[PDB]
Amino acid sequence: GVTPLHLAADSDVNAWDHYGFTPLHLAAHVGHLEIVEVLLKAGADVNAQDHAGWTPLHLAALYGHLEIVEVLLKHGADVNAQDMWGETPFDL
Amino acid sequence: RMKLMIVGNSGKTTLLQQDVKDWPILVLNVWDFLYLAVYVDAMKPWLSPVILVGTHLDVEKQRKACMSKITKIRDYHFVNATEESDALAKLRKTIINESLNVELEKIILSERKNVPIDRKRLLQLVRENQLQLDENELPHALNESGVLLHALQLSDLYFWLCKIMQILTVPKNYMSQYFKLLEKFQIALPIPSSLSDHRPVIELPHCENSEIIIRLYEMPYFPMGFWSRLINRLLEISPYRPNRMYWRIYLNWSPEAYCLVGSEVLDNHPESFLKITVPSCRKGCILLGQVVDHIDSLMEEWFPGLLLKKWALYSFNDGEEHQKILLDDLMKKAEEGDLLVNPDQPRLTIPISQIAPDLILADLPRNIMLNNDELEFEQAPEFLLGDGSFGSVYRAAYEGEEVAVKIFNSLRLLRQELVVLCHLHHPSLISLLAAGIRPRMLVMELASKGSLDRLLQQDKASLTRTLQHRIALHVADGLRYLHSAMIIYRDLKPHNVLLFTLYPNAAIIAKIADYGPGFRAPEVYNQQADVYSFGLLLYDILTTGGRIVEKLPDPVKEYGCAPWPMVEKLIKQCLKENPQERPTSAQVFDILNSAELVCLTRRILLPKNVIVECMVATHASIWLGCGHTDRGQLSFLDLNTEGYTSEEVADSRILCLALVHLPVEKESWIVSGTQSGTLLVINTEDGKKRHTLEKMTDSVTCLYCNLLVGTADGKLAIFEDKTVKLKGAAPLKILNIGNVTPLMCLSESVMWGGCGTKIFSFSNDFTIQKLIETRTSQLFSYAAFSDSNIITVVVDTALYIAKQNSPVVEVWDKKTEKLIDCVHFLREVYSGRVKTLCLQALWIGTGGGHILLLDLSTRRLIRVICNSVRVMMTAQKNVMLVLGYNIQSCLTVWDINLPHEVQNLEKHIEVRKELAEKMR
Ligand SMILES: Cc1ccc(C(=O)Nc2ccc(CN3CCN(C)CC3)c(C(F)(F)F)c2)cc1C#Cc1cnc2[nH]ncc2c1
């Protein structure tokens, strides 16, 4: 239930998999800053959510990839959005 | 205020001036359809007092004769005029004298009756304060005043009044309510009630006297609405093609099965006759029995009382006039023998089965008539069953098997009970064995262990948890079945629960019986009262003694029984005071038909806004590491008294906990690994005797007792169990495996562990024996999960290993050094990411509050089961502890039998259902 864009992000722009992770989510999760920037420049949904409510900013700041956080913020992202548990990318 | 009604045959509204209206006489509401009787036979069905008044007799002695025809009623008045009568003032004075000889709701009704065509309660709350009684103020309150009328389903939220009930002349919710009311008011039937008043010409059946059974009902007066009610109820008749003709019933199914239920009157007779003509064969007598049963039910429920005479017509020889004999005489003859003999020349006789085939219980189902030879039926006094507490029941033997015999002294009750019983075949309902014709009795199967009431009173030791669940589940099944057939049990009591087998895995354990008070709903019935009674019964099952020994108190606190979560909630919701909020019996059974209902021993909720990251179990009690702040708080939760305590012991968040045991000196020290890297050793006996071991370079993330310390830099430090008590103890050796790669897993079974993305093994010599790289499994799950830290390791024959923020659990063979998807299991049956594992079966606690269960052979999903899981582990009756979050912390103590018992029930119910599939 994944598209080659999913695998490219790991190693459609908003198509989701079993876990709700769109390419963006996985790009901000693994730590590929360039892939995140490419995806936002390609028209990504910086306000998307997975099956657990996490946003691309959530995974970007969840692992310490602050450069991806800045790239998302400069591209219309919401810094106060909440997850399933109500936490924000600022919280993580 | 008062209600006045015009009754009788006929000025109607002409005499009312002296359909609903208002008139002061004190103000009254007049309905033209005390009670005023306008004057000769319609007054008897009307009979609250009735006043006789002449029908404007202005057309003398004739009026007096007509009055004395019926009078020789409260009084008589000669109002002999359509207007301005001489005695009109006298009639008004008499009516005033007769009439003279929820107040808040009455006041509020004026505002209530302001609907141009539910929300009325809001109007009762906006402009009133006492109406806040709500539940206690609206139990019956409006139908008593004829305004805003409200088992009618369309009555709770429904509130044209009586004139439209208009259909006799010729909103969707309003139309549905009108249809329901017309069905209730017997104006229209779910086959009209005013079809015709002339009996249609009937077909010609067999007219032989020896071939027909004729039952006559001589009634002096016809009650009003009798025929319409009989038409409505003479429809659920079955001989196992209803060519039905309707008039003010010719129900013929076959040339040998028909009921000619009609009414008539002879020329030389002032009363009325109801005639039933049935064929005297094997099938028609069933129809006759059903028709007699329905007529008796109508004259007992709808129209109590009514002197009614029952005759049966018999002819010794064909071609002779039918001779009518009272049913009491025929019953006496059937009790004495089975032949009616002519008193004159006693040589011609006729069996009762050919005359009154309902006094000898004739034509009962083929598999049910009692064979007088096989059964013992020895109803000797003092050879009772239950010492007579079950009525007049003794013991006997039917076909070599013991049975219970109930003697019936009075034929009405036996036939009513048999008709009730012949359509109740359920695994949880006691089943009919013998009809019991000649002794006039009823024989049932026997329960060896008495009733459940006796078990709860005395034999409490043998009643285990699974036995309680099985009894309650079977009784709920029975109640649900009873309500499925629109049958209402009176009051479900422990005395009505018979126990056959005490083996917990048997298909049937408890049964419901009714051998002809405190277990009462607040409203009293209705099935909501039955659910209330079942809630009380389950309260008395969970609490073994309970209310049968002596708004309810909490069962696990008043009586001190072992806690049973998910059953106390069911009791609470069943015993809800509002009948609309009680669950239906089907829903109650589904709640009982729960795998997690039996095993869930304990459920503890921790103080609000507390975060616990790790726990350990003493061997009951639990130590917990609070992580809702930047201070190291150690909490102590007692699983018995739920005495949650906490204290600050460290300057940094406590990350891991372990328990060193020293049987040599009988010591037990809890070691706490903190974020700053300090191992805090505290004697579990007292918190004062505490110290610290050698401080680690980085955070301490895992501790195991064999004492092994895993840090955030992979520096596994080995501590001898006897040197844990040594203050500032230095480890004998340190593996130093990994890099600045946390060592977070350590398990026994040579023993193994996990750090970063590598698995290591080592023996008693404490050096690396096997190293396995777990990033080679990136083709099965992408690098977002494999490249995470390793958080859990368990072992039986292959290492089951779980990584941080990953819903995938991997399996690695311990020999060749080389796949459970939790999202798949969750979707088939919500975050998915694995937070903890444990082993016994494999238990996987995911971040969304689910606890997946797997077998250790084929990794098959058993059950998926507070919406987070932080850590699950074993403890000791072996149990499982699970900790999760809501943030409101959650502790859940299951019975480790959980993988097995929930399987049993899955088969149990099934085989039990099979019995129903065989009982139909
Ligand atoms: C000897 C005997 C005769 C009759 C019954 C009986 O109950 N029949 C019966 C009738 C009707 C109904 C259902 N109606 C519907 C609505 N009504 C308003 C309420 C109920 C039920 C149902 F069950 F469905 F409710 C059961 C039990 C025994 C027995 C026995 C026995 C067996 N074993 C034993 N061991 N020790 C003692 C002992 C005693």
PDB file of C-alpha atoms in Angstrom, chain A residues 10 17-19 29 50-52 62-63, chain B residues 782 785 805 807 821 823 827 830-831 833:
ATOM      1  CA  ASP A  10      12.566   6.445   3.085  1.00  0.00           C
ATOM      2  CA  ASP A  17      -0.088   4.309   3.423  1.00  0.00           C
ATOM      3  CA  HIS A  18      -1.284   1.950   6.173  1.00  0.00           C
ATOM      4  CA  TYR A  19       0.358   4.207   8.777  1.00  0.00           C
ATOM      5  CA  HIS A  29      11.108  11.180   9.522  1.00  0.00           C
ATOM      6  CA  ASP A  50      -1.301  10.482   9.682  1.00  0.00           C
ATOM      7  CA  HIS A  51      -3.393   7.893  11.535  1.00  0.00           C
ATOM      8  CA  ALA A  52      -1.885   9.268  14.773  1.00  0.00           C
ATOM      9  CA  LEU A  62      10.497  14.829  16.712  1.00  0.00           C
ATOM     10  CA  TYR A  63      14.022  13.707  15.726  1.00  0.00           C
TER      11      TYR A  63
ATOM     12  CA  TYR B 782      11.535   0.678   5.513  1.00  0.00           C
ATOM     13  CA  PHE B 785      11.527   1.828  11.561  1.00  0.00           C
ATOM     14  CA  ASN B 805       8.350   4.182  17.279  1.00  0.00           C
ATOM     15  CA  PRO B 807       4.625  -0.840  14.621  1.00  0.00           C
ATOM     16  CA  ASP B 821       2.836  -6.093  11.664  1.00  0.00           C
ATOM     17  CA  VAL B 823      -1.140  -2.089  11.974  1.00  0.00           C
ATOM     18  CA  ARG B 827      -6.975  -2.755  10.783  1.00  0.00           C
ATOM     19  CA  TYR B 830      -5.155   3.850  16.886  1.00  0.00           C
ATOM     20  CA  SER B 831      -1.443   4.558  16.458  1.00  0.00           C
ATOM     21  CA  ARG B 833       3.566   1.849  16.987  1.00  0.00           C
TER      22      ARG B 833
END
